[PDB]
Amino acid sequence: KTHVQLSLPVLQVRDVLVRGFGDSVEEVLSEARQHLKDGTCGLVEVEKGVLPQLEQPYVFIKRSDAAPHGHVMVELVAELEGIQYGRSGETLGVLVPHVGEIPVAYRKVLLRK
């Protein structure tokens, strides 16, 4: 399938144990895609002071359309030193490895894979 329905656990930034996917734009996008597929991907909602607590390069999920079965359609955009790789709509948050942190909520997304 071109799109996969996912429910992403929403993590508080201060709980997050692994704060990024790796060391290059290409690696973080690769790792983010693999974790999304394996159900080992969390979502941190972006607010004042959140991003400087995470590791660059960042992976964002961004709204790709204006929501089948409640799932917002999203795509991945990476950022490193203020340059983004990809072009999409509004940020739903920043992706991180999920390694068993207790979520505060779930974000239903339809991921273009």
Question: What is the spatial distance between Cα 42 and Cα 2, in angstroms, rounded to a whole number?
Answer: 21
Fold that domain 3-112 belongs to in CATH? SH3 type barrels. (2.30.30)
Q: Which of 66, 56, 74 is nearest to 4 (CA)?
A: 74
CA atoms within 13 A on the CB side of 75: 12
The resolution in Å comes to 2.0
Q: Which of 73, 79, 92 is nearest to 21 (CA)?
A: 79
Question: What is the spatial distance between Cα 13 and Cα 33, in angstroms, rounded to a whole number?
Answer: 20
Question: What is the spatial distance between Cα 102 and Cα 66, in angstroms, rounded to a whole number?
Answer: 30
Strand-pair category, 72-80 with 105-112: parallel
